[PDB]
Amino acid sequence: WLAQRLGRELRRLSDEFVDSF
Amino acid sequence: YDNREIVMKYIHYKLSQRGYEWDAVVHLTLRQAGDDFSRRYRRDFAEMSSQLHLTPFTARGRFATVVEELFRDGVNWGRIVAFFEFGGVMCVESVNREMSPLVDNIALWMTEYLNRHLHTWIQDNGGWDAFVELYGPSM
Ligand SMILES: O=C(O)CN(CC(=O)O)CC(=O)O
Ligand code: NI
Ligand code: NI
B27 Cβ neighbours under 8 A, 6+ residues apart: B6, B9, B10, B13
Comparing alpha-carbon positions, the chain A residue that sits nearest to B67 is A7
**Taking the CA atoms of chain B, what radius of gyration do you get in angstroms?**
14
Q: What technique was this entry resolved by?
A: X-ray
Task: Give the chain A residue whose CA is nearest to the CA of B74.
Answer: A11
Residue B84's nearest CA partner among A16, A14, A19 is: A14
Domain boundaries in chain B?
A: 1-139
Mutate to test the pocket of ligand 1, among B80, B113, B117 (most ligand atoms within 8 A of CB): B117
**CA end-to-end span of chain A, whole Å?**
31
User: Nearest C-alpha to atom 13 of ligand 1 is from which residue?
Assistant: B117
Q: Is B15 in contact with B59 (CB distance < 8 Å)?
A: no
**Which residue, by CA, sits nearest to atom 1 of ligand 1?**
B117
Expressed in Å, this structure's resolution amounts to 1.7
What is the distance between the alpha carbons of residues B33 and B37, in angstroms, rounded to a whole number?
A: 6
3 state SS for B24-74: CCHHHHHHHHHHHHHHHCHHHHHHHHHCCCCCCCCHHHHHHHHHHHHCCCC
> Residue B27 class from Cβ within 10 Å (0-12 exposed, 13-18 middle, 19+ buried)?
middle
CA distance B29 to B41: 19
Fold of B1-139: Apoptosis Regulator Bcl-x (1.10.437)
For residue A14, which of B127, B51, B81 has the smallest C-alpha distance? B81
What is the sign, positive or negative, of the torsion defined by CA atoms of B92, B94, B95, B101? negative
State the CB neighbour count (10 A cutoff) for residue A18.
19
Q: How many helices (H) and strands (E) does chain A have?
A: 1, 0
From chain A residues 1-21, the ones with a CB under 8 A of any chain B CB are 2-11, 13-19, 21
Find chain A residues with C-beta within 8 A of B77's C-beta.
Answer: 18, 21
